[PDB]
Coordinates of C-alpha atoms in Angstrom, one line a residue:
Chain A
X1 CA 0.0 0.0 0.0
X2 CA 1.5 3.3 -1.2
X3 CA 1.8 6.3 1.1
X4 CA -0.7 9.2 1.3
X5 CA 1.6 12.1 0.5
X6 CA -0.5 13.3 -2.5
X7 CA -3.5 13.1 -0.2
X8 CA -1.8 15.6 2.1
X9 CA -0.7 17.9 -0.7
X10 CA -4.1 17.9 -2.5
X11 CA -6.2 17.9 0.7
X12 CA -9.3 20.1 0.0
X13 CA -8.7 22.2 3.2
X14 CA -5.6 22.9 5.2
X15 CA -5.4 23.5 9.0
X16 CA -4.8 26.8 10.7
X17 CA -1.1 27.4 11.5
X18 CA -1.7 28.0 15.3
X19 CA -3.6 24.6 15.4
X20 CA -1.1 23.1 12.9
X21 CA -2.5 19.7 11.9
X22 CA -0.1 16.7 12.0
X23 CA -0.6 13.6 9.8
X24 CA 1.7 10.7 10.7
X25 CA 3.1 8.5 7.9
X26 CA 4.4 5.0 8.9
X27 CA 5.2 1.6 7.5
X28 CA 5.3 2.6 3.8
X29 CA 7.7 3.0 0.9
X30 CA 8.0 6.8 0.6
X31 CA 9.0 7.8 -2.9
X32 CA 10.3 11.4 -2.7
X33 CA 11.3 11.9 -6.4
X34 CA 7.6 11.9 -7.4
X35 CA 6.9 14.9 -5.1
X36 CA 10.0 16.6 -6.2
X37 CA 8.9 15.8 -9.8
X38 CA 5.9 18.0 -9.0
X39 CA 7.9 21.2 -9.5
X40 CA 4.7 23.4 -9.1
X41 CA 5.5 22.9 -5.4
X42 CA 7.5 26.1 -5.8
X43 CA 9.3 26.2 -2.4
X44 CA 11.3 23.0 -1.7
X45 CA 13.6 24.2 1.1
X46 CA 15.2 21.3 3.0
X47 CA 17.4 21.3 6.2
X48 CA 19.4 18.8 8.1
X49 CA 19.0 16.3 5.3
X50 CA 19.8 15.8 1.6
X51 CA 16.5 16.0 -0.4
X52 CA 17.7 13.6 -3.1
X53 CA 18.9 11.0 -0.6
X54 CA 15.5 10.8 1.1
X55 CA 14.7 8.0 -1.3
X56 CA 17.5 5.9 0.2
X57 CA 17.2 6.5 4.0
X58 CA 14.8 4.9 6.5
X59 CA 12.9 6.6 9.3
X60 CA 10.7 5.3 12.1
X61 CA 7.9 7.9 11.2
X62 CA 7.4 10.9 9.0
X63 CA 4.9 13.6 10.1
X64 CA 3.3 15.7 7.4
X65 CA 2.8 19.0 9.2
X66 CA 0.3 21.0 7.1
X67 CA -0.9 24.6 7.5
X68 CA -1.4 27.9 5.6
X69 CA 0.5 31.1 6.1
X70 CA 1.2 34.3 4.2
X71 CA 3.8 34.3 1.4
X72 CA 6.2 36.6 3.2
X73 CA 6.1 34.7 6.4
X74 CA 7.3 31.6 4.5
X75 CA 10.8 33.0 5.1
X76 CA 10.2 32.6 8.9
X77 CA 9.7 28.8 8.4
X78 CA 13.4 27.7 8.6
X79 CA 16.0 26.9 11.2
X80 CA 17.2 29.8 13.3
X81 CA 14.5 32.2 12.1
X82 CA 12.4 34.3 14.4
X83 CA 9.2 36.4 14.1
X84 CA 5.4 36.0 14.4
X85 CA 4.9 32.4 13.1
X86 CA 8.4 31.1 14.1
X87 CA 7.7 32.2 17.7
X88 CA 4.0 31.8 18.5
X89 CA 2.6 29.4 15.8
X90 CA 5.2 27.0 14.5
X91 CA 8.8 27.0 15.7
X92 CA 11.2 24.9 13.8
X93 CA 14.3 23.8 15.7
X94 CA 17.6 25.3 14.7
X95 CA 18.9 21.8 14.0
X96 CA 15.8 20.9 12.1
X97 CA 16.1 17.8 9.8
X98 CA 13.5 17.6 7.1
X99 CA 11.8 19.6 4.3
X100 CA 9.3 22.4 4.1
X101 CA 7.1 22.4 0.9
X102 CA 5.2 25.7 0.3
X103 CA 3.4 26.9 -2.8
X104 CA 1.0 29.7 -3.6
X105 CA -2.6 28.7 -2.9
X106 CA -4.3 32.0 -3.9
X107 CA -6.2 30.3 -6.6
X108 CA -8.1 28.1 -4.1
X109 CA -7.6 29.4 -0.5
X110 CA -8.1 33.1 -1.2
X111 CA -11.7 34.2 -1.3
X112 CA -13.3 37.6 -2.1
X113 CA -13.9 39.6 1.0
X114 CA -11.2 37.6 2.7
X115 CA -10.6 34.0 4.0
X116 CA -10.7 34.2 7.8
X117 CA -10.9 30.4 8.4
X118 CA -7.1 30.4 8.7
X119 CA -5.8 31.8 12.0
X120 CA -2.4 32.3 13.7
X121 CA -1.3 33.0 17.2
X122 CA 0.7 36.2 17.8
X123 CA 0.6 36.8 21.6
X124 CA 2.2 34.4 24.1
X125 CA 4.3 34.5 27.2
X126 CA 7.3 32.7 25.6
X127 CA 8.5 31.3 22.3
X128 CA 7.0 28.0 21.3
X129 CA 9.3 25.0 21.8
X130 CA 10.2 23.2 18.6
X131 CA 7.2 21.4 17.2
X132 CA 4.9 22.7 20.0
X133 CA 1.2 23.2 19.4
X134 CA -0.9 25.6 21.5
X135 CA -4.6 25.6 20.8
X136 CA -5.5 27.5 24.1
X137 CA -7.8 30.3 23.1
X138 CA -7.9 31.8 26.6
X139 CA -7.5 35.6 26.8
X140 CA -3.8 36.4 26.9
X141 CA -2.7 38.6 29.9
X142 CA -0.7 41.6 28.7
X143 CA -0.7 43.6 32.0
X144 CA -0.8 43.5 35.8
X145 CA -4.5 43.0 36.1
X146 CA -6.1 39.6 35.5
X147 CA -9.1 40.2 33.4
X148 CA -11.3 37.2 34.2
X149 CA -10.5 35.5 30.8
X150 CA -12.8 37.9 29.0
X151 CA -11.4 40.2 26.3
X152 CA -10.6 43.8 27.3
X153 CA -7.9 46.4 27.4
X154 CA -4.4 44.9 28.1
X155 CA -5.7 41.4 27.7
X156 CA -6.3 40.1 24.1
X157 CA -7.4 37.0 22.3
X158 CA -4.0 35.5 21.2
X159 CA -5.3 34.4 17.8
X160 CA -5.6 36.4 14.6
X161 CA -7.2 35.6 11.2
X162 CA -5.3 36.1 8.0
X163 CA -8.3 37.1 5.8
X164 CA -6.6 36.0 2.6
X165 CA -8.0 37.9 -0.5
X166 CA -7.3 36.9 -4.1
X167 CA -5.7 40.2 -5.3
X168 CA -3.0 40.7 -2.5
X169 CA 0.6 40.7 -3.5
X170 CA 2.7 37.6 -3.8
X171 CA 4.2 38.1 -0.3
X172 CA 0.8 38.3 1.2
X173 CA -1.1 35.7 -0.7
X174 CA -1.8 32.3 1.0
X175 CA 0.9 29.7 0.8
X176 CA -0.1 26.1 1.6
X177 CA 2.8 24.7 3.5
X178 CA 3.4 21.0 4.4
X179 CA 6.4 20.3 6.6
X180 CA 8.0 16.8 6.7
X181 CA 9.2 16.1 10.2
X182 CA 11.4 13.0 10.7
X183 CA 12.0 10.4 13.4
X184 CA 14.6 7.8 14.3
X185 CA 14.8 6.6 18.0
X186 CA 16.6 3.5 19.0
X187 CA 14.4 1.1 17.1
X188 CA 14.2 -0.4 13.5
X189 CA 12.6 2.1 11.1
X190 CA 9.2 1.7 9.4
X191 CA 9.4 4.2 6.5
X192 CA 12.0 3.6 3.8
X193 CA 12.5 5.3 0.5
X194 CA 13.9 2.3 -1.4
Chain B
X1 CA -4.8 55.8 28.5
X2 CA -2.1 53.3 29.5
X3 CA 1.0 55.3 30.3
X4 CA 4.6 54.5 29.3
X5 CA 7.4 57.0 30.1
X6 CA 10.7 57.4 28.4
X7 CA 13.9 58.7 30.1
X8 CA 17.6 59.0 29.6
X9 CA 17.8 61.5 26.6
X10 CA 20.1 64.4 26.6
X11 CA 23.1 66.2 25.1
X12 CA 25.8 63.9 23.8
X13 CA 29.0 64.5 21.8
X14 CA 29.3 63.0 18.2
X15 CA 30.6 59.5 18.1
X16 CA 29.4 58.7 21.6
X17 CA 27.0 56.1 22.9
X18 CA 23.7 56.4 24.9
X19 CA 21.1 54.2 26.6
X20 CA 17.5 55.3 26.5
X21 CA 15.0 53.9 29.1
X22 CA 11.3 53.3 28.9
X23 CA 9.0 52.2 31.7
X24 CA 5.4 50.9 31.8
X25 CA 2.9 51.4 34.7
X26 CA -0.1 49.3 33.8
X27 CA 1.0 46.9 31.1
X28 CA 3.9 44.4 31.4
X29 CA 6.7 45.3 29.0
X30 CA 7.9 41.6 28.9
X31 CA 4.4 40.5 27.7
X32 CA 4.0 43.0 24.8
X33 CA 5.3 44.2 21.4
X34 CA 7.6 47.1 22.1
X35 CA 9.2 49.3 19.4
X36 CA 11.4 52.4 19.3
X37 CA 10.5 55.2 16.7
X38 CA 12.5 58.4 16.2
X39 CA 11.4 61.6 14.6
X40 CA 14.2 63.9 13.5
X41 CA 13.5 67.6 13.8
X42 CA 11.3 68.6 10.9
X43 CA 11.5 65.2 9.4
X44 CA 9.3 62.1 9.1
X45 CA 9.0 59.2 11.5
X46 CA 11.3 56.2 11.1
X47 CA 10.6 52.9 12.9
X48 CA 13.9 51.9 14.5
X49 CA 13.5 48.5 16.2
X50 CA 11.0 46.1 17.8
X51 CA 11.1 43.5 20.5
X52 CA 8.5 40.8 20.7
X53 CA 7.0 39.3 23.9
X54 CA 9.3 36.2 23.3
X55 CA 12.4 38.3 23.2
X56 CA 12.8 38.3 19.4
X57 CA 13.9 41.7 18.1
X58 CA 14.4 43.3 14.7
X59 CA 16.1 46.4 13.3
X60 CA 16.1 48.5 10.2
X61 CA 19.0 48.1 7.8
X62 CA 19.9 51.8 8.2
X63 CA 20.4 51.1 12.0
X64 CA 21.7 47.5 12.1
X65 CA 25.0 47.3 13.9
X66 CA 24.5 50.6 15.8
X67 CA 21.3 50.3 17.9
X68 CA 20.4 47.5 20.3
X69 CA 17.1 46.9 22.2
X70 CA 16.7 45.1 25.5
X71 CA 14.2 44.7 28.3
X72 CA 14.1 44.2 32.1
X73 CA 11.5 41.8 33.4
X74 CA 11.7 42.7 37.1
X75 CA 11.7 46.5 36.9
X76 CA 9.3 46.4 33.8
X77 CA 11.4 48.6 31.6
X78 CA 12.6 48.7 27.9
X79 CA 16.1 49.8 27.0
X80 CA 17.7 51.0 23.7
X81 CA 21.5 51.0 23.6
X82 CA 22.8 53.4 21.0
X83 CA 26.4 53.3 19.7
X84 CA 28.4 55.5 17.4
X85 CA 25.8 58.3 17.3
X86 CA 26.2 60.9 14.6
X87 CA 24.7 64.3 14.2
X88 CA 21.9 63.0 12.0
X89 CA 20.7 60.8 14.9
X90 CA 19.3 63.9 16.6
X91 CA 15.7 63.1 17.1
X92 CA 12.9 62.6 19.6
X93 CA 12.9 58.8 20.4
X94 CA 9.5 57.3 21.3
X95 CA 8.7 54.2 23.2
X96 CA 5.5 52.5 21.9
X97 CA 3.5 49.4 22.6
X98 CA 1.9 48.1 19.4
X99 CA -1.2 45.9 19.4
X100 CA -3.6 45.0 16.6
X101 CA -6.3 47.2 18.1
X102 CA -4.1 49.5 20.2
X103 CA -0.9 51.6 20.0
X104 CA 0.2 53.2 23.2
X105 CA 3.0 55.7 22.7
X106 CA 4.9 57.5 25.4
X107 CA 6.0 61.1 25.1
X108 CA 9.5 60.7 23.6
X109 CA 12.8 61.8 25.0
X110 CA 15.1 64.2 23.0
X111 CA 18.6 63.1 21.9
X112 CA 20.9 65.9 20.9
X113 CA 24.1 64.8 19.2
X114 CA 26.1 68.0 19.0
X115 CA 29.3 69.7 20.2
Chain C
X1 CA 12.2 48.8 0.1
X2 CA 8.5 49.9 0.1
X3 CA 8.2 53.7 -0.2
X4 CA 4.9 55.5 0.6
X5 CA 4.1 58.8 -1.2
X6 CA 1.6 60.7 0.9
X7 CA -0.3 63.6 -0.7
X8 CA -1.2 66.4 -0.4
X9 CA 1.8 67.7 1.5
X10 CA -0.5 70.2 3.3
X11 CA -4.3 69.9 3.5
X12 CA -5.6 73.4 4.2
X13 CA -9.2 72.7 5.1
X14 CA -11.6 74.9 7.0
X15 CA -12.9 73.3 10.3
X16 CA -15.7 70.8 9.9
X17 CA -14.8 69.9 6.3
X18 CA -14.3 66.3 5.3
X19 CA -10.6 65.5 5.0
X20 CA -9.3 62.9 2.5
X21 CA -5.6 61.9 2.7
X22 CA -4.0 59.8 0.0
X23 CA -1.2 57.3 0.6
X24 CA 0.1 55.3 -2.3
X25 CA 2.5 52.3 -2.0
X26 CA 5.1 51.3 -4.5
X27 CA 4.4 47.6 -3.8
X28 CA 1.2 45.7 -3.5
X29 CA 1.0 45.3 0.3
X30 CA -2.7 44.3 0.6
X31 CA -4.6 46.1 3.3
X32 CA -1.7 45.9 5.8
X33 CA -1.3 49.6 6.4
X34 CA -1.6 51.8 9.5
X35 CA -2.5 55.5 10.0
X36 CA -1.1 57.6 12.8
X37 CA -2.4 60.9 14.2
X38 CA 0.3 63.1 15.8
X39 CA -0.4 66.4 17.6
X40 CA 2.6 68.8 17.5
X41 CA 5.1 68.1 20.3
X42 CA 3.3 64.9 21.2
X43 CA 3.7 61.2 20.3
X44 CA 1.7 59.7 17.4
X45 CA -1.7 58.1 17.9
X46 CA -3.1 55.1 16.1
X47 CA -6.2 55.8 14.0
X48 CA -6.6 52.9 11.5
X49 CA -5.2 49.4 11.4
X50 CA -5.2 47.1 8.4
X51 CA -6.3 50.3 6.5
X52 CA -10.0 49.8 7.3
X53 CA -10.4 49.0 11.1
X54 CA -10.8 51.9 13.5
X55 CA -8.7 51.5 16.7
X56 CA -10.3 51.6 20.2
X57 CA -11.1 55.1 21.4
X58 CA -10.8 56.7 18.0
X59 CA -13.9 58.7 17.2
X60 CA -16.2 57.3 14.5
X61 CA -15.5 60.2 12.2
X62 CA -12.2 58.5 11.2
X63 CA -12.3 55.8 8.6
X64 CA -9.9 54.1 6.3
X65 CA -10.2 52.8 2.7
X66 CA -8.3 51.5 -0.2
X67 CA -6.0 48.5 -0.6
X68 CA -3.0 47.0 -2.3
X69 CA -1.3 50.2 -3.6
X70 CA -3.9 53.1 -3.1
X71 CA -4.9 53.8 0.5
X72 CA -7.0 56.8 1.6
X73 CA -7.7 58.1 5.1
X74 CA -11.1 59.8 5.5
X75 CA -12.1 62.2 8.3
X76 CA -15.9 62.8 8.0
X77 CA -15.6 66.2 9.8
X78 CA -12.4 68.0 10.9
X79 CA -12.7 68.9 14.6
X80 CA -10.4 71.5 16.2
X81 CA -8.2 68.8 17.7
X82 CA -8.0 67.0 14.3
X83 CA -5.7 69.7 12.9
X84 CA -2.5 67.7 13.2
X85 CA 0.0 65.6 11.2
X86 CA -1.0 62.2 9.8
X87 CA 1.4 59.5 8.8
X88 CA 0.7 56.3 6.8
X89 CA 2.8 53.3 7.6
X90 CA 2.7 49.9 5.8
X91 CA 2.4 46.8 7.9
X92 CA 3.7 44.1 5.6
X93 CA 5.8 42.8 8.6
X94 CA 3.7 44.2 11.4
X95 CA 4.6 46.1 13.6
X96 CA 7.5 46.9 11.3
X97 CA 7.3 49.0 8.2
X98 CA 8.3 52.4 6.7
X99 CA 6.4 55.6 7.1
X100 CA 5.1 58.2 4.7
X101 CA 6.3 61.8 4.6
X102 CA 3.2 62.9 6.4
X103 CA 0.4 65.4 5.7
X104 CA -0.2 68.6 7.7
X105 CA -3.7 69.8 8.3
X106 CA -3.5 73.6 8.8
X107 CA -5.1 76.5 6.9
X108 CA -3.5 79.6 8.3

């Protein structure tokens, strides 16, 4: 049974970056050339691994981390980067091993009058740990006074909506991003390229 | 209005260094987006630097390598270390908290780089 | 680098007149643009965020419009306090961004 990569890439709807959905791939022969053959996946940045050699290595599990972000914030998705998404939504470790695959999705994700179904976290006490998810929608405290978990001055909802519109610039159009996160821990692997 | 007060601005010789200070009464500086913006006399505003709640900070290319931004969690202050100040740096430097629905500026402190 | 050309340099309206302030961007930045009010000798004050949304405490007379490369601040009626400088700042990397040269609201 072949692996579901193309199901992840062509999923009809992607998850919000703050609640970044994770799909786990295991016990399958993962052909990476075929996804690399789909050049319309414009961004193919890879770190801590050789993208070509993925077809030769084995891994215990591969996580298909899928979400949507603005085009300009795509730069924040990389090792050692900082900013809105890299801190409060999806922090990649500075020693990250894997690949990020991002492509413009304005043709489908963007809607007239904005697409607000995609949301991102921007307020938090500290940086997210690598691969940390935080769905907590509680009112974030930004001052001395506790504000009873109800929105008001100096205490805000930590999530904001992108509102993607079709006509925005390339740097601000939605970019569907799927991030391959790898695993190998003291046991025989399950996923192998060859 | 939430009040933030700047301090530490004054006369300085060319080529010197300076540290501006900014304090917050109501809000917590460590838990907010804080930026420094200067307004040279009779000239437009120029955003200098920002520090995020998580400690991430950014600078303009015109100021990279000269200005540095830092915070104090216990005292609840924001600091801007300035190095190699020229005459053109003469400006009122503001401390501002930026939020999607709010922007709380202080009242600025003058920096005079002159002989 | 994104450069914003505010116009007119000076907007000499009589009090109570509607004030329209143009701010044009050299790049398509979407609606990520912010407008700041600034009384003389005082720190700026946020009016509009994302070019359309009025900030808290700002009177309803203020309103924003335009997108992408042509943005316009609209004051339905200039009050005496409204006679001040106004800056447009892009927010492509919020809260970062460059400012416009500003527009002065004074008649004589």
